[PDB]
Design a protein around this ligand. Structure first.
Ligand SMILES: [Mg+2]
Length: 135
């Protein structure tokens, strides 16, 4: 089990090697070119959206350095989901990663900082601090 009860502070610093999905690519060269996303990361705790970073224009290695602080009640996990900001309609899912509060609370806890692998591709650097208790 293991849940978190307290304040969660997370800084979504930057991502690298983001890969455009076939859908985001649907829109014809006509020359071998690299498609650049307009990415942002959505922060979800359990199944609730906490917020999202700003959208960066034309880059697959965005640097947001956006910080979020939220009160967590019986928190199970954090999900970071990268999206491509579409001009019209729903944004396109790009990649994601999930972090269980249980792994963050392992002896010592309170402060985590490192690169987290995104699925299918890429990685995001985050700084996570917890101020509460496990249970
Ligand atoms: Mg939008």
């Amino acid at each position: 089990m293991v849940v978190f009860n307290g304040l969660l502070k997370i800084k979504i610093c930057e991502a690298v090697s983001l890969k455009p999905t076939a859908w985001s690519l649907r829109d014809v060269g006509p020359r071998p070119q690299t498609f650049l996303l307009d990415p942002y990361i959505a922060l979800n705790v359990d199944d609730s959206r906490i917020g999202q970073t700003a959208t960066k224009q034309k880059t697959n290695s965005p640097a947001w350095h956006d910080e979020f602080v939220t009160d967590v009640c019986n928190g199970r996990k954090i999900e970071l989901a990268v999206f491509h900001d579409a001009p019209i309609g729903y944004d396109d899912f790009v990649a994601n990663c999930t972090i269980q509060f249980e792994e963050l609370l392992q002896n010592g806890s309170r402060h985590f900082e490192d690169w987290i692998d995104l699925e299918p591709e890429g990685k995001v650097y985050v700084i996570i601090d917890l101020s509460g208790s496990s249970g």
